[PDB]
Ligand binder design. Sequence first.
Ligand SMILES: OC[C@H]1O[C@@H](O)[C@H](O)[C@@H](O)[C@@H]1O
Length: 253
Amino acid sequence: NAPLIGIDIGGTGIKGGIVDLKKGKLLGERFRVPTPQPATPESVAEAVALVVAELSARPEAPAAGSPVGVTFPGIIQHGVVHSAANVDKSWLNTDIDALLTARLGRPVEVINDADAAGLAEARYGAGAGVKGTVLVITLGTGIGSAFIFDGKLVPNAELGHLEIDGHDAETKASAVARERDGLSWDEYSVLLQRYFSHVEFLFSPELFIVGGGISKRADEYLPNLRLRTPIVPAVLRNEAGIVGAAIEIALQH
Ligand SMILES: OC[C@H]1O[C@@H](O)[C@H](O)[C@@H](O)[C@@H]1O
């Protein structure tokens, strides 16, 4: 049926795509603009507007007033941001749905970035057909987590902020932390063994799906892990957030 525009707000880039929910893929190429710095509500709103404007002008674009799905790296409750771990703190308590709807001139509904990735994996990726608890852990600027149960999203799980060995988990195990501390893939594997085995004890999941940029290098560390839970890289990576954002619109509507 009718495609929907999905927007993924990341630390280094704000990208979007026209999503065909029938195939779980994008129509045409994804479009990206640099994440403004500082990334404030006002600057980010402008960047999102540019991405949406570009996609809306394409022949394969959905109706001009169709709702747009957008991701954000934080807790989202009733369109309001409740955490801003790696973004400007001015985002806290910001009604992002209202902010973007006003700027774009069409309905906009935001969802956590990891949650969106989870919806996508559950519907079109490594989580399809898997019942029970499925945890999608994304490794990038921060550590994101989508809690899926029986194919349904249990919203806003922030497992990247579990405390492990005296530290906020992502401060030591994010993709960024790995480079900052000069860790080899094997040393990083030690940190991940600790993280996943801990989360495994916390939830006894049926499956772990690893997302985020460096999940593309999963063969460098997953083979070293010794878990009771099967663990595989995510099917969608560069487009997981975009697709998941569109899925959320559909589910809500
Ligand atoms: O972007 C990945 C994750 O980073 C964490 O620091 C944020 O708290 C999460 O909301 C986000 O999903």
